[PDB]
Design a protein around this ligand. Structure first.
Ligand SMILES: O=P(O)(O)O[C@@H]1[C@H](O)[C@H](O)[C@@H](OP(=O)(O)O)[C@H](OP(=O)(O)O)[C@H]1O
Length: 502
């Protein structure tokens, strides 16, 4: 019939006493859950981009595990030991590419890679779980290890070991050595209607719901869920979505640089929706979800004009393309109205020499009004993500301590976070006993444009114990303004509202 393969991207739907898709709480918190009322089979989850896993072959963790004994006075042995762990780490890559597309058989030993987080689902053999007492702590480690090996074995005996894994099949994922099989909990988390998944012998069956077949040539083809910017040919501007006069507007943004492709911005990024029937994987139609906010793109009331819509369902949010390949230069057409996108010069307004030029549409098909489908790096997408996290972590904490007390569990994570931010913004140099400390521009223009910095200030403040909070945030500030003349101006203005207490 139809089988599962190495490379297929699927979701895993629990079918025990608790049901749900496995998912993360983000790129800050390394825990795995089934949010049961978030989505079923019939009604798929809202942020279903987070319940997607790739099926990976068995990874090699021998020389890499050796190297994780940094028990040594000697340096050359350490450089010896690492060189292996890097050779091995690349030997995996070589081989896993060969095993691409091969049918998984029951009782092979695959790893399950989380797409959105890019971490490996992992049993930690020598731990308790956090919410459940007996069960082992299943986490998401980045590089993986021996406890990320899983025997994929059949739940009901309708099929058996050796037999090829068909789509939909209920399986038990069982760790190779790490002990007990994966199990979706009966315990809701303290903070989130979210059940903690862990490793303990229980009668949970995992439904394998295929999303995208192992045929997604990239970066080679535009397919659903790619993140791209839409640059303008003639106007030389990126399609952007932000607010003006408290109103969300879609526009081409005016730049003041000597390079048009350099004007890169997070608010310019869009997720692709290669429209399907069942929620799954050049002749059919597309919807553009604004990677920052979550709202989609549509043209309503030139007969029409492009603006954001809060939900991507209405037949307005759907577009068509005209000359699919990566980095294509297309002319896009609005379906429900049959019109060709067009850019204007009347901007939005109160500003002196503004930047937000309005975009509408026209029944006349042009030639110059072409948009470049500039592919965004997957890493950059995760930077928006690992930063959006920081905004909502401090979103709760700076709200929680602004009107009372926080728990002893919260300090330990925000202090952790404010350490992670230091490790991020300097492109993984700084952190403690340092050696060097040199900044990163992407993350800077991201500390700001995603309001990490806005949070920091609305955190320090207790208006009308800290030895590792303030001025820890101020060391983060100290980093994010480095040689950055625009961020300097921002932190100077933000410090203007900060002193306003007196
Ligand atoms: O180097 P400076 O003079 O301090 O200012 C930077 C740059 O020269 C532009 O003014 C601006 O890009 P735009 O022209 O596109 O606004 C940019 O913002 P960005 O780096 O956040 O894009 C600033 O950081």
């Amino acid at each position: 019939s139809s089988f599962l393969h190495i490379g297929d991207i699927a979701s895993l739907y629990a079918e025990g006493s608790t049901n749900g898709f496995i998912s993360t709480l983000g790129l800050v918190d390394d825990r795995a859950v089934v949010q049961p009322e978030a989505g079923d089979l019939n009604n798929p989850p809202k942020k279903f981009r987070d319940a997607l896993f790739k099926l990976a072959p068995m990874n090699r963790y021998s020389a890499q595990k050796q190297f994780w004994k940094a028990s040594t006075t000697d340096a050359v042995l350490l450089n010896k030991l690492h060189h292996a762990a890097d050779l091995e780490k690349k030997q995996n890559e070589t081989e896993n590419r060969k095993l691409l597309g091969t049918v998984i058989q029951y009782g092979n030993v695959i790893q399950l890679l989380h797409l959105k987080s890019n971490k490996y689902l992992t049993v930690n053999k020598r731990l308790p779980a956090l919410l459940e007492k007996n069960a082992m702590r299943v986490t998401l480690d980045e590089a993986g290890n021996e406890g990320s090996w899983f025997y994929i074995q059949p739940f009901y005996k309708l099929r058996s070991i050796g037999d090829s894994v068909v789509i939909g099949d209920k399986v038990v994922l069982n760790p190779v050595n790490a002990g007990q099989p994966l199990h979706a909990s009966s315990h809701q988390l303290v903070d989130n209607g979210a059940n903690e998944v862990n490793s303990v012998n229980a009668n949970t069956s995992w439904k394998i719901v295929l999303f995208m077949k192992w045929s997604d040539n990239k970066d080679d083809i535009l397919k659903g869920g790619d993140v791209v910017r839409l640059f303008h040919a003639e106007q030389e501007k990126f399609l952007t979505a932000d607010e003006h006069r408290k109103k969300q507007h879609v526009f081409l943004r005016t730049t003041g640089r000597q390079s048009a492709t350099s004007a890169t911005s997070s608010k310019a990024l869009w997720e692709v929706e290669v429209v399907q029937h069942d929620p799954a994987r050049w002749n059919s139609l597309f919807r553009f979800k604004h990677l920052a906010t979550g709202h989609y793109l549509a043209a309503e009331v030139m007969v029409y004009s492009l603006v954001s819509v809060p939900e991507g369902n209405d037949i307005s949010s759907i577009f068509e393309l005209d000359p699919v390949p990566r980095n294509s230069y297309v002319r896009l057409r609005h379906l429900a109205t049959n019109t060709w996108v067009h850019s204007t010069n009347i901007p939005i307004k109160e500003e002196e020499k503004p930047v937000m030029l309005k975009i509408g549409t026209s029944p006349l098909k042009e030639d110059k009004e072409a948009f470049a489908i500039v592919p965004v790096s997957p890493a950059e997408v995760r930077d928006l993500d690992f930063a959006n996290d920081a905004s909502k972590v401090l979103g709760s904490i700076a709200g929680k301590l602004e009107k009372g007390t926080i728990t002893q569990n919260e300090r330990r994570s925000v202090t952790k976070l404010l350490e992670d931010l230091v490790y991020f913004v300097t492109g993984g140099t700084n952190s403690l006993e340092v050696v060097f400390s040199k900044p990163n521009r992407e993350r800077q223009k991201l500390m700001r444009e995603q309001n990490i910095l806005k949070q920091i200030f609305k955190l320090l403040q207790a208006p009308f114990p800290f030895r590792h909070i303030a001025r820890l945030a101020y060391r983060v500030l100290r980093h994010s303004q480095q040689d950055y003349r625009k961020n300097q101006e921002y932190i100077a203005k933000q410090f203007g509202f900060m002193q306003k207490q007196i």
